Amino acid sequence: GLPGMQNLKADPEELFTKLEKIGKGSFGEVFKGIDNRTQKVVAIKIIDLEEAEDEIEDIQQEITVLSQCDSPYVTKYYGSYLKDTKLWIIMEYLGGGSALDLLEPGPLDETQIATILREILKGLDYLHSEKKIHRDIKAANVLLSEHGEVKLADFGVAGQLTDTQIKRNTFVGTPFWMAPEVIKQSAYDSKADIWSLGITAIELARGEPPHSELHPMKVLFLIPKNNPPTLEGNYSKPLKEFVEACLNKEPSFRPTAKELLKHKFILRNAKKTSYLTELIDRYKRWKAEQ
């Protein structure tokens, strides 16, 4: 039973005008689309189910997790449609670019980094309160609306905790951002997302996560072996400390998302999300001169 799945008589090729490919998600490509009834722009992920086996279970879970989320900090889910062998997953469209794209014209300043991290933390606090774990936190999965609103996307590997299953052990995520306990498949919880947040903070400050120049297989031994990464360069002490707070090998030593919302780096530097339009405009202009 796939949540939000619509009637098979509903033809998504009739209900939506599929436009250009905007990227990829887990299991399929993502396209920009227009909802023909409201004229609102949507993001559509298309999965060829015939081109899949033992992935439908992971596909169902992504949809279930998305459907149970109701937050200004998480991409909205508008239902699923089956067209022959292809599943159309309709999601909220965010036109501002990902935090990673916004890094292309040049570095971010600490106000921008703090603002983005604060909104990610709002999303993480929501998910964690709902006993959900995102598991793929990185700048490419942090999307902005054209107004500067920041939301979490890519629920392809998200997990659910229950009163019976208080911890997860599955190997999921993107190597460079994965927590040591996830890579070693130890019992883990929401603290794994706090480690990925620390890596994301380095990425927002430097433009790339640690070990970015290495093969992802090398990081599978390096992350559990090495001391946790630190933020190197001329960055503020509160920013380096924020990074260090997230990047502790001991998960119980990592603060919760709610606690990090009161970190001095956030409180001293974060500003209204509306200021992020300057970053969106900077990217639009840059793109136009490439």
Ligand X SMILES: N#Cc1cccc(-c2c[nH]c3ncnc(N4CCOCC4)c23)c1
Q: Is 132 annotated as a binding residue?
A: no
Nearer to Mn ion, 123 or 251 (CB): 123
136 labelled catalytic: yes
Does 101 bind Mn ion (CB under 5 A)? Our answer is: no
> Which spans of this chain sit near ligand X (rule: CB under 6 A)?
22-25, 30, 43, 45, 75, 91-94, 98, 141, 143, 153-154, 156
Do the beta carbons of residue 95 and residue 101 sit within 8 Å? Answer: no
Q: Is 18 annotated as a binding residue?
A: no
Does 62 bind Mn ion (CB under 5 A)? Our answer is: no
Do the beta carbons of residue 83 and residue 12 sit within 8 Å? Answer: yes
Cross-sheet strand order for the sheet of 150-152? 97-98, 142-144, 150-152
Does 154 bind Mn ion (CB under 5 A)? Our answer is: yes
Q: Is 213 annotated as a binding residue?
A: no
**Tokens representing residue 65 in the block:** 């997790």
Residue 237: which H helix or E strand, with range?
Answer: helix 237-246
Which span sits near Mn ion by CB under 5 A: 44-52, 147-155, 178-186, 200-208? 147-155
> Which of Mn ion, ligand X, none lies near 45, with the C-beta cut-off 5 to 8 A by kind?
ligand X
Per annotation, catalytic residue among 136, 163, 189, 281: 136
Q: Is 22 annotated as a binding residue?
A: yes
Measured torsion, CA atoms of residues 189, 191, 197, 199, in degrees rounded to the nearest 10: -100
Chain centroid offset of residue 279 CA: 19
CB of 159 to ligand X, least distance (A): 16
Beta-bridged to residue 32, according to DSSP, are 43
Point out the residue whose Cβ comes nearest to Mn ion: 154
Q: Which residues are part of a known binding site for Mg(2+)? A: 141, 154
Q: Which residues are part of a known binding site for ATP? A: 22-30, 45, 92-94
- Cite the active site residues: 136
